[PDB]
Design a protein around this nucleic acid. Structure first.
Ligand SMILES: [Zn+2]
Ligand SMILES: [Zn+2]
Ligand SMILES: [Zn+2]
Ligand SMILES: [Zn+2]
Lengths: 96, 73
DNA sequence: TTTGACCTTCGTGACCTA
DNA sequence: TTAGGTCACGAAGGTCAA
């Protein structure tokens, strides 16, 4: 796409786009699990730590909120349904 | 390596490499808010062998080496 | 009544197929 | 192109035999 391989959550090296925002392979994994599990993080501090390639894992609540602000959408996360389905059709078409 | 008693380090814990011992002693300490008093000069030497000599100085070092209290649950 | 070796969870992220 | 699946690793918890 030509836009900088830099994660907008933690400044780490981004491997591209994930759920609609340029992110590292780690924050991607995070953002999804977060939504899929419906987690409720709460930042000990005054809700405003700075996410960095190194501290990130420190305050989840802020990471998540940050993921969300740079635009990542849950919309892009396949439902449980969708998955089972595809997984099946494909698997059946293994029929040899 | 445990930055506290020196003994082998299971890995980081509440922010600092540390043996299993210094982990439990630091958990228990917090979860129970125990408070120790130093028997001497408050600069006792803490190591594998004599890490139980003075609870005050042990715990105290833990903080000193950077162990966090809010890291405990 | 404290220890601390051991064990149980579970969130992580680097890698990989598609 | 990105999606989900892997899964080997922490790091927090906990257990109980001394
Ligand atoms: Zn990131
Ligand atoms: Zn925060
Ligand atoms: Zn130690
Ligand atoms: Zn002492």
């Amino acid at each position: 796409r030509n836009v900088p391989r830099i994660c907008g959550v933690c400044g780490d090296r981004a491997t591209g786009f994930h759920f609609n925002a340029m992110t590292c392979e780690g924050c991607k994994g995070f953002f999804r699990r977060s939504m899929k599990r419906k987690a409720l993080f709460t930042c000990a501090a005054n809700g405003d730590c700075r996410i960095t390639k190194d501290n990130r894992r420190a305050c989840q609540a802020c990471r998540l909120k940050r993921c969300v602000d740079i635009g990542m959408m849950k919309e892009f996360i396949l439902t449980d349904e969708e998955v089972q389905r595809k997984r099946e059709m494909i698997l059946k078409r293994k029929e040899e | 390596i445990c930055a506290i008693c020196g003994d082998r380090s299971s890995g980081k814990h509440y922010g600092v490499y540390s043996c299993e011992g210094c982990k439990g002693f630091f958990k228990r300490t917090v979860r129970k808010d125990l408070t120790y008093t130093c028997r001497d000069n408050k600069d006792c030497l803490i190591d594998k062998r004599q890490r139980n000599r003075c609870q005050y100085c042990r715990y105290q070092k833990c903080l000193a080496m950077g162990m966090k209290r809010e890291a405990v649950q």
